[PDB]
Design a protein around this ligand. Structure first.
Ligand SMILES: NC(=O)c1ccc[n+]([C@@H]2O[C@H](COP(=O)([O-])OP(=O)(O)OC[C@H]3O[C@@H](n4cnc5c(N)ncnc54)[C@H](OP(=O)(O)O)[C@@H]3O)[C@@H](O)[C@H]2O)c1
Ligand SMILES: NC(=O)c1ccc[n+]([C@@H]2O[C@H](COP(=O)([O-])OP(=O)(O)OC[C@H]3O[C@@H](n4cnc5c(N)ncnc54)[C@H](OP(=O)(O)O)[C@@H]3O)[C@@H](O)[C@H]2O)c1
Lengths: 338, 335
């Protein structure tokens, strides 16, 4: 039933991901009571019209997050706006100040304690003072953290945990495409990647979560990034731009954490514009006793980004106040209704 | 070194591997139970070829070993079906001893053996003991599949396909898989009124119960796996002729009132050279999902999962506690 759930939600950002999320919230019976955007064209429009549902929702998109929360006091803010706590702290402060629970796609919020310790401590204290839970989730929740820790649970001895992942820029919106340096020159890329304040890699937060969940001690952290290059003329649907042979179309990171206790963790991740025939991958190997393998074939990264944030909403409402990371939440479960 | 004091109940193919893993985790082996007169009185360390004696003499008297050692946990690798396993599980529950077992039916026995399940659950609760079926299925057929299901918006069908090798395991399992029988002997056996429940039926009962759904329909079928060429079974030390039964393949299906359908095909047979174990699962719905574990190490992860479960089973409430209800399985270098 359309609004069968007690849960009242604000959709914070209305981009590629929250457009999908909004439709899934309605399918679960969640009541959408508010919607926050930045583009002037979008403010004032009905969310239902803006998402191209044949029904109006009776929700007018606002450009004023604090005003929407003060007017609606939702159970949950569902955030798909940015990646790094340096940016995301602005939206997460507004949620926590108003005692509003927040689930966010911010990749750094997956496990932010090590990469952004000051902002993490600040947000955790604020959220605790107002009874609110803040949780970073998305694709990584199952496919790079909880399913990998579960696979590790079948090992007697672990020497190395190795992950390899590929996702398509053109499955996502301009925020991520621009952050992946799509359409930049190699010279622009080299200045950016060497920059003093380059954000932490998505994979660093993944490995911090696995190391912390396993209860191990960091001995050494290393990282490297190279641009992904167009081999021929391509187009980015995410930015609506032509890409010439030699243009940057994304990048590949490799992150590595050695533990004092012996296990080594390594994760290579490419986020780039795909040409025809390319597909996402999720491939993990454990070297030890025994050797283990996990693959998810052409893994639906885009859809499971959105399903995981949605299926987390009851967990995040029910969880203790503060920053609660997905390794500490109960097992993610299939729920037709909320 | 661990506080955990364990009795290794059965000393066959799987408990021989398990014993060495228990020692690696720092678990104290305080007793060992066998059936064979040949094994009784031997030091467990000698019997397993550890190259140190353990100071533990194998006994054929389970009750006596439990009364004498009062272990935290009995680690059972003896048999599969509650009809058999109730004998060892009664001795553990009577003595208030926690038990982790490889018994495949104990993965989720409530529907296939409701009377024996109720009896054992009541007895274990009266003495403060936890009884838990685990092994290979725990992660690869139940908990990892329920986790994958957690990423679906809508599920139409959950479909599994699994292969394991009889010759990775001991005579108990090889004999129960009808290895070396004729097709006519197999057809009489498989049609029998008291044929035990399929391993896969217990898998699907667990997934359906974990998802909180309602059974509408249960179907099952079995066919023998046939030698296409001359083979040998190392498990039974027998030559197998073209046309001989070398194991069997089950297909189990549960339709739910709510819509989702579960299906699981499992083959347990003697392998020829080049064959490998498989674990391949598909979820049809929104979205479509896939999981594969390559040439999955079924033999090693049978033993690692029972070992890695021991802290969970000690800490769990008394009664039959199924692995879908336990906290997430975790890697622990030391117990
Ligand atoms: N964890 C994961 O697996 C995962 C997966 C996919 C994406 N993400 C992350 O989620 C974020 C969003 O991705 P996307 O594909 O949806 O990008 P997108 O299409 O660019 O959407 C971003 C949205 O944020 C809005 N916005 C920007 N600043 C805002 C503010 N101060 N207040 C309210 N709204 C604001 C934009 O508004 P307008 O529409 O009005 O411009 C836009 O709707 C990115 O950082 C991406 O990296 C994470
Ligand atoms: N859940 C799973 O993933 C999984 C995986 C592998 C195996 N299993 C099951 O685990 C069981 C054992 O497998 P295995 O490969 O280790 O078989 P195995 O080598 O035949 O070992 C069976 C053991 O049971 C012992 N035994 C029989 N009756 C006994 C009793 N009353 N008290 C104490 N010991 C007794 C036998 O002792 P003697 O040697 O002294 O005759 C033998 O050592 C089989 O039922 C198999 O189906 C389950």
């Amino acid at each position: 039933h359309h609004h069968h759930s007690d849960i009242r939600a604000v959709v914070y950002g209305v981009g590629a991901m929250n457009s999908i999320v909004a439709g899934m919230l309605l399918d679960k019976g969640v009541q959408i009571v508010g919607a926050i955007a930045r583009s002037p064209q979008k403010v004032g429009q009905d969310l239902g019209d803006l998402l191209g549902l044949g029904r109006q929702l009776g929700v007018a998109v606002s450009d004023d997050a604090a005003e929407v929360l003060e007017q609606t006091h939702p159970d949950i803010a569902v955030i798909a706006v940015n990646s790094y706590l340096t940016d995301a702290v602005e939206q997460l402060r507004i949620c926590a100040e108003h005692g509003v629970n927040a689930v966010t796609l911010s990749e750094e919020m997956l496990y932010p304690w090590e990469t952004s310790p000051e902002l993490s401590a600040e947000l955790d204290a604020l959220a605790k003072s107002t009874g609110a839970t803040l949780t970073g989730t998305g694709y990584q929740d199952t496919f790079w953290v909880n399913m990998i820790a579960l696979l590790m649970g079948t090992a007697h001895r672990i020497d190395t945990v190795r992950g390899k992942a590929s996702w398509n820029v053109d499955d996502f919106g301009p925020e991520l495409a621009t952050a992946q340096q799509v359409g930049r020159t190699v010279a622009e890329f080299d200045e950016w990647v060497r920059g003093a304040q380059r954000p932490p890699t998505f994979g660093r937060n993944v490995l911090d979560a696995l190391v912390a969940d396993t209860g191990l001690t960091v001995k050494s952290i290393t990282t490297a990034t190279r641009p992904d290059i167009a081999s021929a003329a391509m187009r980015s649907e995410a930015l609506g731009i032509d890409l010439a042979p030699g243009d940057v179309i994304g990048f590949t990171d490799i992150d590595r954490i050695e533990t004092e206790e012996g296990p080594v963790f390594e994760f290579e991740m490419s986020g780039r514009v795909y040409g025809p025939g390319e597909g996402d991958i999720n491939e993990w190997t454990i070297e030890g006793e025994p050797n283990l393998f996990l693959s998810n074939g052409t893994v639906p990264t885009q859809t499971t980004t959105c399903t995981q944030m949605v299926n987390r909403i009851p967990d995040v409402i029910a969880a203790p106040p503060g920053i609660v990371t997905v390794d500490r939440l109960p097992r993610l479960r299939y729920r037709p209704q909320f």
